[PDB]
Design a protein around this ligand. Structure first.
Ligand code: GDS
Length: 1336
């Protein structure tokens, strides 16, 4: 090895000894170090054995022949040089290891191999080098090498093909070749499929076998139970032993990528030397630029497996954490669950498990970032002098800044959240009582409150804009900041230190590399600290006490046996059932009897192993069907609620439904039994749910029934019918053991056994007649009583943000990326000045200009981040104002036609992506667009010839960008829609834990939850593979431009001054990272800009008549006497109201009677103009209603609706939201409403904080509060809508409102009889018009 023939000549030939030693030791050596390690994977991972195919044999036979040929050399050598013995034998032995390896790989089922491909590639390259040398030298030993090379080439070609393999849509990962598994080509079929036709959930491939929940949840369960047995228990230790072997391969892929990333600056330093050093062989530059393409492209292929491993491991964590929490939630004791809120347990997957997946992306960087920093600091310390310390200074000041900034954000980040949270419940209230809200004209009153809370959160967002501005400045200007400090302290520390390209552009490339680790380490630290509390919560939940599975003896088919059993609701709390004993025989009806808080429901809970048994013996025999007091309704259809995951039997189902008297309920419900009952679907009355729960229990066909007050909410006739056909000895369950908790005597004599208790103690149980004869405790008890988003949407967002702010940001950021190219061009000029006297003559002026330009870069980066977030706040406030005004200035018809969920989602999620997502995405997309365009301008300007690569790369970028957008706009949309159902189902199962554990349907629910999370993963996994595909394809576009920006800089080195080449290559090096973010953010932006369109949709719908006309406004005393006249009124809805010509005189009490389907209520809607008059001229006194603005009439007429809607806040804000009426008037009205005694009782006086809908207040109180509102209004026209306190409200409406004209729509004739001039509506027509005396 000497430089004359290898380096310094025009024919770069390797020496003969080098050829025969190192070029042969490289490949053989590769297989020898990998072979042992490869058994680990081959053994731990197995997939069967591949059959005998021609390909596998072809490879094995060539491996045999190759070994022979290599040993044939040893034979000829045996037939002087020491290398002519060891090298052929070593090659033969490693070849024998190669053929054995394909053999064992066949045995272990590996269709495509990575080691058996890279090894042949390395051998091929080594053979190619020797081949070229041997063909340039020119029989004896050469022909053996030609045979070796041809066989190696054919072996390499064979190794590319994938062997035969050992539901449809199987994940192509299982059937993909290794060469296509690094380029992620197996998803390309989806990509094109994403552009031609939209993707549904039916086309996503089935989750691969390992990631499925049944494979990753049981392993975590086993590892956690093992740790608990070890007993103190830590989840981090269990998470390690579970997800550590897979995450361990991330270290190898990360470490190689880190080392290969810093090869860029080193090869750049060599290339700057080659350009600067003349008379050097040309081929040297071609070799140097070839190493810039192989190293930075292999870096892409090795980095986009670290990311894949980290993402797959995080997704596995999210799948296993969700399943483990779900499986633990079904065995947790009640006392333990009291310590955790229901919604907080759902947070264990909604945010807690998501935090682990988010962490897993960058968790492996807490060591890579310090390693990148240390290695870079070592490299640049050699590049320049000890000035690194100065740059280190800028680094040791920048990192703490980020740190505190991150912390600060987090705190008020949470603040923002809670503010939004508050608003959202308020928003719900407006969507709840919208009808009563528009009846009294409270729209303006509540719009002000929503605007106030909006301003409250907008101040926090405004501050966080400042914190994001410094975060972006530290992301962009930190590499420059370090560069400026280092260059300044280097060039001015003395006079013998100069700045040439090899000392400037290499350091610049290192600083560009160093930017990411410094600016992402604080985020990683914040994420780890945030996950430190998520881990604590997860461990706390998973370490709760488990339910005793043997406490109740569940013997399969004296039916229920309890002796000396005392139960508790908690370990330390006193017993609730003391010393209970009773024996319920098979097929007997037993009624639990007691007062409130006696311990009746506790008995049924204890028979289900819900109570904590401190002592005793319980031997419930056979299956148990539980009808809980609080009915648990699944959001599935009513049919599946009754079925409860059981085979449908038409005769049995149709015998159960009417026996519960569910036929009228089926009739009223829209779809019948297929209607979607539950909280999300149609709401059901308490009695209806009681029947449904009972119907489900009856269908379940258990032998033991525990009916914890099934007839509480059903009426007396319905209850008696139910008992007759279901629980009665002559019902459907004649031969079923029934144990019922009741407080109604009506069915007691029919009960076989009555268990009467007092204070959780058995008290003289027995049969009804015997207990009555005994005259004891029972006698006492009885005596007790889709396409591409339009640019018009972008223009709409620009109009909302403001043209001034929109154009100022673009101009000021173009200024940022113009002062950046010129500053780097100033460095190009600086590194090309004469070096006369060993001192840069113009060091002062050039350093000052560079620093001033960079400071100009420090005012424009902070200027475009302060003009995109401020604009974001300004646009969000305008969008919220417009949406609120549109919604509040619209009639009630679309409120029925448009579901409330849509509007609440628009007010919740849509406003979140406009203020907290769009400003960040637009700062990065626009930040990366000119980063690319500006980088391509320097490359093109330095070497014009680099323009014929622009056409071929433009097509690749266009076709990759279009496919990725068209396919990933839908995949994360399919993932978002499938994420909420998992949390919803977990909430549902948490609500009904006791029912699930009683019916013993735990396995079905556990499998449903894992199927739903599997459906979520089915959309999440293609989403993370799409990013890898996009990056890999566009990295090699930014990688081949590195080759071409340096190739044209090598062929034209003569017409270059070693001042542009380093600049061009340095800028091309950062093209790769900024190009995959231009496209990722071009896809997020499209799915984020659709929020503006969905937030502006209601700006184009029919609105109500103007609230204030102000041209034909009525006088202050508009209802002078209150003379109402319906002149040929007709209300469209075909006409519910028709031919209505009636006259209600001023101060004359008038009521409206009619059956269901008449226009009684619709008549009130006529008075308040809720629905526009199809044909009618209602006039109050001498003024037409249709001409008057809505608010005016709605203020001058009052209504007391069916169910009074009390809004959250104080009672005074309920009575007078505008606070227009004085405190004395409020007090007088409240006293006149029979409420003075109660309203004076609250500690908060008039400021009593009533919850959503006035849950704390009683129904009677809420009704009297609505009456107080009407009384405080002091208007001459009042309408009443009648459905205990009836005597009070009727007397109050008859007390002082005799002066005012009162219309009354009552479903009860008793009250209407008092009112004169009763109007009767048959089908909208006036059937009778006269006083009740003329009625009879
Ligand atoms: N040197 C790194 C290179 C990392 C790399 O090349 N890939 C980056 C791309 S820049 S990822 C960096 C990015 N930061 C920003 O771009 C924000 C900058 C500033 N806040 C502003 O507003 O301007 C960020 O926060 N990202 C987090 C996210 O994805 O949400 C990555 O993390 N890829 C993630 C992926 O592909 O999924 C390494 O060691 O590998």
């Amino acid at each position: 090895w000497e430089w004359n023939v290898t380096w310094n000549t025009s024919n770069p030939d390797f020496t003969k000894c080098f050829q025969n030693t190192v070029l042969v030791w490289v490949p053989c050596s590769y297989l020898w170090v990998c072979f042992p390690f490869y058994f680990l994977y081959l053994s731990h991972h197995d997939r069967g054995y591949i059959q005998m195919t021609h390909l596998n044999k072809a490879k094995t036979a060539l491996g045999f022949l190759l070994w022979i040929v290599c040993w044939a050399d040893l034979f000829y050598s045996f037939w002087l040089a020491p290398v002519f013995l060891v090298s052929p034998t070593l090659l033969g032995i490693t070849m024998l290891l190669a053929t054995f390896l394909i053999q064992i790989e066949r045995r272990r089922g590996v269709q495509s191999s990575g080691i058996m491909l890279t090894f042949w590639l390395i051998a091929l390259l080594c053979a190619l080098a020797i081949l070229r040398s041997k063909i340039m030298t020119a029989v004896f030993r050469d022909v053996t090498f030609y045979i070796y090379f041809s066989l190696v080439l054919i072996q390499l070609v064979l190794s590319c093909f994938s062997d035969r393999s050992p539901d449809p849509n199987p994940c192509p990962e299982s059937s993909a070749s290794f060469l296509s598994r690094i380029t992620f080509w197996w998803i390309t079929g989806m990509m094109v499929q994403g552009y031609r036709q939209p993707l549904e959930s039916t086309d996503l491939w089935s989750l691969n076998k390992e990631d499925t929940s049944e494979q990753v949840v049981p392993v975590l369960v086993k590892n956690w139970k093992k740790e608990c047995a070890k007993s103190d228990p830590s989840l981090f230790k269990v998470l390690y032993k579970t997800f550590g072997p897979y995450f361990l391969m991330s270290f190898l892929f990360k470490a190689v990528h880190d080392l290969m990333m810093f090869a860029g600056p080193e090869i750049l330093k060599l290339l700057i030397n080659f350009v600067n050093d003349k008379k050097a062989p040309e081929w040297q530059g071609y070799f140097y630029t070839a190493l810039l393409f192989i190293s930075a492209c292999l870096q892409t292929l090795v980095l986009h497996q670290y990311f894949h491993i980290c993402f797959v491991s995080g997704m596995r964590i999210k799948t296993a954490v969700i399943g483990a929490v779900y499986r633990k939630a079904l065995v947790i004791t009640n006392a333990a669950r009291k310590s955790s809120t229901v919604g907080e347990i759902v947070n264990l997957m909604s945010v807690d498990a998501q935090r682990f997946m988010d962490l897993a992306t960058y968790i492996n960087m807490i060591w890579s970032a310090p390693l990148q920093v240390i290695l870079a600091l070592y490299l640049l310390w050699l590049n320049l002098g000890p000035s690194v310390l100065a740059g280190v200074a800028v680094m040791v000041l920048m990192v703490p800044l980020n740190a505190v900034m991150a912390m600060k954000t987090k705190t008020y980040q949470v603040a923002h959240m809670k503010s939004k949270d508050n608003r959202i419940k308020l928003m719900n209230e407006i969507l709840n009582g919208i009808k009563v809200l528009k009846l009294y004209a409270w729209e303006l009153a509540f719009k002000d409150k929503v605007l106030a809370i909006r301003q409250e959160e907008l101040k926090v967002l405004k501050k966080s804009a400042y914190l994001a501005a410094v975060g972006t400045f530290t992301w962009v200007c930190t590499p420059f900041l370090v560069a400026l400090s280092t260059f300044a302290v280097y060039v001015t520390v003395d006079e013998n230190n100069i700045l040439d390209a090899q000392k400037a552009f290499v350091s610049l490339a290192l600083f560009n590399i160093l930017r990411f680790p410094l600016n992402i380490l604080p985020m990683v630290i914040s994420s780890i600290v945030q996950a430190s509390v998520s881990l604590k919560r997860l461990r706390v939940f998973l370490s709760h006490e488990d339910l005793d599975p043997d406490s109740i003896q569940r013997r399969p088919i004296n039916s229920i046996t309890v002796k000396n059993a005392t139960f508790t609701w908690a370990r330390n709390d006193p017993p609730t059932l003391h010393g209970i004993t009773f024996s319920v025989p098979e097929g007997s009806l037993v009624a639990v009897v007691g007062q409130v808080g006696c311990g009746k429901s506790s008995l049924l809970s204890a028979l289900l192993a819900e109570m904590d048994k401190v002592e005793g013996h319980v031997t419930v025999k056979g299956s148990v069907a539980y009808v809980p007091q609080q009915a648990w309704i699944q959001n599935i259809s009513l049919r599946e609620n009754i079925l409860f995951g059981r085979q449908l039997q038409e005769r049995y189902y149709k015998a159960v439904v009417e026996a519960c008297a569910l036929l009228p309920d089926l009739e009223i419900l829209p779809s019948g039994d297929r209607t979607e009952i539950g909280e999300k679907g149609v709401n059901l009355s308490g009695g209806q749910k009681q029947r449904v729960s009972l119907a489900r229990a009856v269908y379940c066909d258990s032998d033991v029934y525990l009916l914890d007050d099934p007839l509480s909410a059903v009426d007396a006739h319905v209850g008696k019918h139910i008992f007759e056909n279901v629980i009665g000895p002559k019902g459907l369950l004649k031969n079923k053991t029934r144990l019922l908790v009741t407080h109604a005597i009506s069915y007691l004599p029919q009960m076989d056994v009555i268990i009467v208790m007092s204070g959780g103690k058995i008290s003289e149980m027995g049969s009804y007649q015997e207990l009555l004869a005994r005259d004891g405790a029972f006698a006492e008890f009885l005596r007790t009583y889709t396409g591409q988003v339009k640019l018009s949407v972008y223009w709409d967002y620009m109009k909302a943000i403001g043209l001034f702010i929109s154009f100022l940001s673009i101009f000021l950021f173009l200024c940022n990326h113009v002062a950046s190219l010129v500053s780097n061009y100033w460095l190009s000029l600086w590194t090309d000045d004469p070096i006369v006297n060993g001192t840069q003559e113009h060091t002062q002026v050039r350093l000052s200009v560079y620093g001033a330009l960079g400071i100009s870069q420090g005012i424009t980066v902070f200027g475009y981040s302060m003009a995109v977030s401020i604009g974001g706040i300004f646009a969000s406030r305008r969008l919220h104002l417009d949406l609120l005004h549109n919604v509040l200035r619209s009639p009630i018809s679309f409120f029925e036609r448009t579901p409330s969920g849509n509007l609440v989602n628009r007010f919740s999620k849509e406003l979140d992506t406009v203020d907290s997502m769009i400003p960040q995405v637009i700062k990065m997309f626009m930040g990366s667009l000119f980063n690319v365009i500006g980088a391509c301008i320097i490359i093109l300007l330095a070497t014009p010839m680099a323009a014929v690569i622009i056409p071929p790369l433009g097509l690749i970028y266009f076709f990759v960008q279009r496919f990725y957008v068209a396919s990933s706009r839908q995949l994360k949309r399919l993932e978002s829609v499938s994420r909420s159902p998992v949390y919803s189902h977990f909430n549902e199962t948490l609500l009904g834990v006791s029912v699930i554990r009683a019916f013993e349907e735990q396995e079905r629910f556990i499998r449903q939850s894992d199927l739903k999370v599997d459906e979520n993963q089915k959309a999440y996994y293609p989403s993370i593979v799409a990013n890898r595909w996009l990056a890999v394809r566009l990295e090699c576009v930014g990688n081949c431009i590195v080759l071409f920006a340096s190739l044209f800089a090598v062929i034209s080195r003569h017409s270059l001054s070693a001042g542009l080449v380093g600049l061009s290559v340095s800028y091309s090096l950062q093209v790769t990272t900024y190009l995959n973010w231009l496209v990722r953010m071009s896809s997020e932006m499209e799915t984020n800009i659709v929020a503006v369109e969905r937030l502006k949709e209601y700006s184009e719908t029919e609105k109500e008549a103007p609230w204030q006309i102000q041209d034909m406004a009525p006088p202050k005393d508009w209802p002078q006497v209150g003379r109402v006249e319906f002149r040929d009124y007709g209300l469209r809805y075909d006409l519910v109201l028709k031919h209505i010509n009636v006259t209600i005189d001023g101060g004359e009490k008038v009521g409206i009677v009619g059956r269901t389907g008449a226009g009684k209520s619709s008549l009130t809607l006529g008075l308040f103009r809720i629905k526009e008059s199809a044909e009618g001229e209602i006039i109050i006194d001498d003024i037409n209603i249709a001409k008057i603005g809505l608010h005016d009439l709605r203020f001058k007429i009052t209504i007391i609706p069916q169910d009074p809607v009390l809004f959250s806040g104080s009672l005074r804000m309920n009575l007078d939201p505008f606070s227009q009426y004085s405190d004395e008037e409020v007090w007088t009205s409240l006293e006149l409403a029979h409420l003075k005694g109660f309203v004076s009782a609250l500690p908060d006086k008039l400021n009593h904080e009533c919850a959503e809908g006035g849950e704390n207040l009683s129904v009677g109180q809420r009704q009297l509060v609505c009456l107080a509102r009407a009384l405080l209004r002091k208007t001459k026209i009042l309408v009443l809508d009648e459905a205990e306190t009836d005597d009070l409200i009727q007397s109050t409406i008859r007390t002082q409102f005799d002066d005012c004209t009162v219309l009354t729509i009552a479903h009860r004739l008793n009250t209407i009889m008092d009112y004169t001039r009763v109007i009767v509506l048959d089908k909208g027509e006036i059937q009778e018009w006269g006083s009740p005396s003329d009625l009879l």
